[PDB]
Amino acid sequence: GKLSEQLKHCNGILKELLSKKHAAYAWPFYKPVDASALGLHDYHDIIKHPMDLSTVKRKMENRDYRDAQEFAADVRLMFSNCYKYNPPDHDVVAMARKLQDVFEFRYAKMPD
Numbered sequence: 001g002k003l004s005e006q007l008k009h010c011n012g013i014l015k016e017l018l019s020k021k022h023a024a025y026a027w028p029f030y031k032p033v034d035a036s037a038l039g040l041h042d043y044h045d046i047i048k049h050p051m052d053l054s055t056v057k058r059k060m061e062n063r064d065y066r067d068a069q070e071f072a073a074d075v076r077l078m079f080s081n082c083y084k085y086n087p088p089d090h091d092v093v094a095m096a097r098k099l100q101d102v103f104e105f106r107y108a109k110m111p112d
């Protein structure tokens with residue numbers, strides 16, 4: 001039941017990250033980065049493993065994640081992609097930092 005319990009905590013975090021409470025800074029992470037639409041023609045040369053909250057949601061719904069660690073690896077991959085691609089002074093990086101702070105502090109309260 002630990003794995004079930006821990007994955008329910010993960011699902012709770014995911015719902016929070018997608019909630020109106022965090023929408024002001026979470027919105028760039030809702031859907032896959034559309035590189036063409038944003039004119040980011042080097043995005044897929046720099047980012048080899050794209051990740052976003054809609055993909056995390058699909059994987060949770062599909063029971064793709066077997067444990068909390070696998071879930072956290074995708075959420076952190078999403079933030080890492082943002083920190084790798086973008087100049088550190090871009091607004092999206094500040095938004096990533098703020099959403100990661102929400103993630104890390106609640107992920108840390110994982111039930112044992």
Ligand SMILES: CCNC(=O)c1cc(-c2cn(C)nn2)nc([C@@H](C)c2ccccc2)c1
Pocket residue numbers: 028029033038040081082085086087090091092095
């Ligand atoms: C190298 C310069 N970067 C961009 O032009 C850029 C990158 C991203 C982005 C999204 N993710 C998940 N990673 N990167 N998003 C925007 C847009 C949507 C935007 C504009 C204003 C504030 C917040 C985001 C612009």
